[PDB]
Write a protein that binds this ligand. Structure first.
Ligand SMILES: Nc1ncnc2c1ncn2[C@@H]1O[C@H](C[N+]2(CC[C@H](N)C(=O)O)CC2)[C@@H](O)[C@H]1O
Ligand SMILES: Nc1ncnc2c1ncn2[C@@H]1O[C@H](C[N+]2(CC[C@H](N)C(=O)O)CC2)[C@@H](O)[C@H]1O
Ligand SMILES: Nc1ncnc2c1ncn2[C@@H]1O[C@H](C[N+]2(CC[C@H](N)C(=O)O)CC2)[C@@H](O)[C@H]1O
Ligand SMILES: Nc1ncnc2c1ncn2[C@@H]1O[C@H](C[N+]2(CC[C@H](N)C(=O)O)CC2)[C@@H](O)[C@H]1O
Lengths: 343, 343, 341, 343
């Protein structure tokens, strides 16, 4: 299967074991912004669902499928690969919807659907949108979508912006400098200080922040789920040219994302921006190894390259330079092992 | 391999990836009770090391091997399966001990050692002592131990005692009760409430507590690492009979452990008891889905059965009853997936 | 009789035996807010009583009739069905008011009065205003009221508002969870857990609380005693639409009531609101078996249906929903069996 | 029926409505002394139940029948008049004992049993033992008992003792004196003060107390349930002659009770005495209208006459005198309407 080919089995096992827990499903369900916005997007665009055939990619508890049912869908195929699939089946029965919702256990890349569908619904977004690589399953599912069929969400925007946060930056060295002591219980640890610094900076930082740390208007990279192919997500190149609104040291790039449900009646947005109420996605920050000084009016140019790996995540390569000075910075990050800083 | 035969590859990959991070080694190293007590046990029993051959099972950063070197060991074989092995080699060189500490990368079940050893050192204790199943590697390593050889630690004591803690119980039940809702966004979840209660209560609670919640003197189960065979740890049956010192609700059983380094000069104890300074092991509590009411003077009898599984952990079954009334409670816990309440 | 037809004898016996005790009359009389406010309402509107004919429905000790006498009433018919009537007569004589207060023993639905009256006075309010169904006797008594006659109290307002109180909810759930035990002295009780939850949550909680638990402005349901007919109280439908002021868990609805004495000189209010001094009515809360999550700005809509029963109380049906999400709750409560917290 | 003839319908309605509540059954069940002692009495006398035919009079939740089942009873007829009978039936089914326990809805005076029984079990005790008059149903049930059959409980002892409690005595007047004011909101209430006093003194006081208020060894009146006829409980004349252990003012009589289960293996006692842990029966105190002064060594003699009424309770007539002085006091109380004083 397309899934097995791009995924190490260990990662897959861990991944689907994770979503097999009712507590995790609960965690997602209790994100009111997320769940409420999905429900609103579906119900307020009822003409896109009334008497239509729906596919729910990775249904988990089945919540989105129930929303599709509330909107008057004729038939909903709810595909789920973790053991949660059996819990979803229990809920379909207890909610007396066996005639409209059909739970299909397995990976969307591997199962068979009896018919083509009018619309695909899913919640495949991870940290900085792409983590977990579930968007590829979402796009893969379009083999079951009728021509002129729709996708909910329809588009996803990843936003990047430079930030300044001296304390976050210094924190890394504060932690790494544990190893910079010549006699920890008689042992000289200093030779590993460099490796410890490297390790900490390889971790994207998951948490939220004050919008005032942002130093320029965000650059946006858009994925149109109606048009995109799975292969499009294997290598994501995000060029950027920031026009600095404030002077100071740029310690790295902040990441967040929006998705839009573009229905026949209206477009509904779900945003994880730092200007919006917090979600379980928080925001993500990737530090530069060396901060870059910029003046208001300077331009900070470069590239963020996301390379998919078989651990259902991305290797992140960020290169940035201040055009006016030529001062340059690079970093390589492992999105699979983020540092959850939020407290 | 003995290791591969008892371990799902997924679990192993995850497991050794975890210990490959310097931050984790740092976390363990910064547990001063742990590190200081190991150093004390080794240095105060220096005659057990001076001019001896040592095996360090799962050396991590290599700290224990350095303690063995400080104690005058002639040769130390430091076996480590994670990539941390590469970092240990760096420290051996930067500390000018290349003539004495020899890092051997690989599983202790799989590597080859040049000679038999006088003493095995290791830190194989997990939560509730047995978590991670690393004790089996430790015991397995005894194939390299001389007949008159020693083990550091030499023995392990698991302590269990009944506790009362209304707040914790209600804390978990509150979480479980999410699945009691008959109309979550219009969806009836209640059919899954039982499954949800089971899941949350399968989680051992890792944290510390006031000793006054304990309702009876602890029961002790001892493993002698010098005598035990790894096969002995596949099924661990711990019967208990508590003489209740206080009347009230028994919400579950609390667990901690001690290990002893029985050297020629002195015996040194490392304790994780709640009467002792806190360690990174904290303590572990297994909750009952329904508490058992007992009066002072009653006897609380039963069994704690640990069945090893392929995820490097144990399936825990606890059956307890108040003998005077026949009030019985049975419980299943998944030691691999605990709830870290300390945060 | 209208009373007997709507009342089981067991309930009636118990009810009037209850009010036959001097300790109970004492308990009510010592509610100073109540007694003082009634006295204030009557005396400050003395012109509505001066040389007037009065009917006191359910006079108990006779206190309100004495207030009517103080205000200058010419003659007061004080009707009382319990044995307390004999004690009231003792007080009428010991206070030398035999020429002005006339105790009529019996139920107001059954006795005969010599003449029509200018004004009816009564204290017929129970928990949630309607408990005990004495308002129906009060309204029934209007057959003795002259046209354009007055009633003290004149109107009653029932207030309802959503509240959050996790502690109360868990307090009740904890009690219910006794029946969750799989081995109580070796016996599995779990099969009855559902029935136990239903029973406990069927109990309205009588007590007071901090106003900060209230999550929206109260909704008001008004009964005009001058216009209402007793039949109006057999089935009381109270629709509601709350505009949520705070985000959180709605554990149920809180209930209280006000009554107003609309006299010629001034309008006097007697309130049991949690913003006001405590009375023996306290306040009443109806819990949901499962709380409803709401955000500030959401609307919580539904209906409270009160159906009178033959035990001189009400069967309560509460249906509520968060309009934005469709989260719905239905509950059935037995006002006859409240929990005094 | 015998029940209807001795009971006002209103009282019966209220009575069985009361026990129809799970909360009340629970209230009784949660009395650990009561329930635990019944269980102990039944299980420790297992030879009295093993392969026997049992009758449970007023089974309520059915708890005692399950205890009879634990003891090995062959068949248990569980009679219950309230709607609780249906809840008991649910538990019989859920505990897989339909082959051994037969729930019979209705009054034991009115239902038909197919067979004679070896032993009757019941918990028919009220305040002062006799309140609620359920002992008469218990004795009435012996028409179904084999000649060589047993009763559990086998005997009941009601204890009476003189007490001194100045504050309790004064309390009555403190409350009654509410009516002794000439202008309560302008009203002279004084004319009702006497009636208020009378009312308060007619109420037995239900609560507990310090045993030091007791001025003499209790007098005991024993009912042997194996020998007694229900008619014996219509008029209970309890003569007493107390040998005063302390000097002082006697304000009234305190009441409590014991029952004994006289089995083949052992006799088990259930006590509600103030020297024992508190039960849901508390204790009962009946005041004298006027206190009696007594010296240590004096004898306090008289009679407590309990006259059964149609409200499933008793009118209590107490006459007492100090023999040495001839000082006499009496009271008449209505046990149907006690004052619950406990705090
Ligand atoms: N390839 C796949 N085939 C089938 N199911 C898949 C696949 N990849 C992930 N999933 C599942 O989708 C789920 C992703 N999610 C959504 C849960 C639910 N729709 C909600 O919105 O609450 C939890 C976030 C998660 O349960 C995964 O197990
Ligand atoms: N079968 C195995 N073969 C070789 N190494 C193994 C095996 N199982 C676990 N390990 C490793 O031991 C280590 C266990 N520990 C000890 C670290 C060090 N000794 C200290 O005290 O600081 C971190 C706690 C951990 O690094 C594991 O990777
Ligand atoms: N249908 C009826 N006919 C005559 N009397 C009735 C009827 N229903 C209730 N009552 C009686 O009114 C009384 C109600 N109350 C009022 C006492 C007095 N007015 C005060 O405010 O202090 C005590 C509260 C109570 O004694 C009942 O017995
Ligand atoms: N004449 C009668 N026939 C049948 N049942 C009767 C009769 N009189 C009372 N009862 C019932 O006995 C019960 C008395 N009790 C016992 C409950 C249970 N056996 C226990 O020990 O927990 C609650 C205390 C109560 O439920 C009454 O409804």
């Amino acid at each position: 299967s397309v899934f097995s080919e791009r995924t190490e089995e260990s990662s897959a096992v861990q991944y689907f074991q994770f979503y097999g827990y009712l507590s995790q499903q609960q965690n997602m369900m209790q994100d009111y912004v997320r769940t409420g916005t999905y429900q609103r997007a579906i119900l307020q665009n009822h003409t896109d669902f009334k008497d239509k055939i729906v596919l729910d990619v990775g249904c988990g508890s089945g919540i989105l499928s129930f929303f599709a049912a509330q909107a008057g869908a004729r038939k909903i195929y709810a595909v789920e690969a973790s053991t949660m699939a059996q819990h979803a089946e229990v809920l379909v029965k207890s909610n007396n919807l066996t005639d409209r919702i059909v739970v299909i256990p397995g990976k969307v890349e591997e199962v068979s659907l009896p018919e083509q569908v009018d619309i695909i619904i899913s919640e495949p977004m991870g940290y900085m949108l792409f983590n977990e690589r579930m968007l590829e399953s979402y796009l893969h599912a379009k083999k079951y979508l009728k021509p002129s069929g729709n996708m909910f969400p329809t588009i996803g925007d990843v936003h990047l912006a430079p930030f300044t946060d001296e304390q976050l930056y210094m924190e890394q060295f504060t932690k790494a400098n544990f190893w910079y002591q010549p006699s920890f219980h008689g042992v000289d640890l200093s030779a590993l200080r460099g490796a410890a610094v490297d390790e900490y900076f390889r971790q994207p930082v998951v948490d939220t922040f004050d919008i005032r740390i942002l130093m320029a208007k965000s650059v946006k990279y858009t994925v149109n789920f109606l048009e995109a192919k799975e292969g499009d997500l294997h290598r994501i190149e995000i060029p950027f040219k920031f026009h600095m609104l404030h002077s100071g040291l740029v310690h790295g790039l902040a990441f967040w994302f929006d998705v839009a449900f573009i229905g026949s009646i209206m477009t509904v947005w779900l945003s994880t921006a730092p200007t919006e109420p917090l979600t379980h996605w928080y925001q993500v920050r990737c530090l530069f190894q060396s901060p870059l000084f910029a003046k208001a009016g300077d331009t900070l140019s470069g590239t963020c390259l996301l390379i998919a790996n078989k651990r259902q995540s991305y290797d992140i390569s960020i290169v940035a330079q201040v055009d006016q000075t030529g001062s340059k910075s690079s970093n390589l990050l492992d999105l699979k092992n983020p540092f959850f800083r939020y407290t």
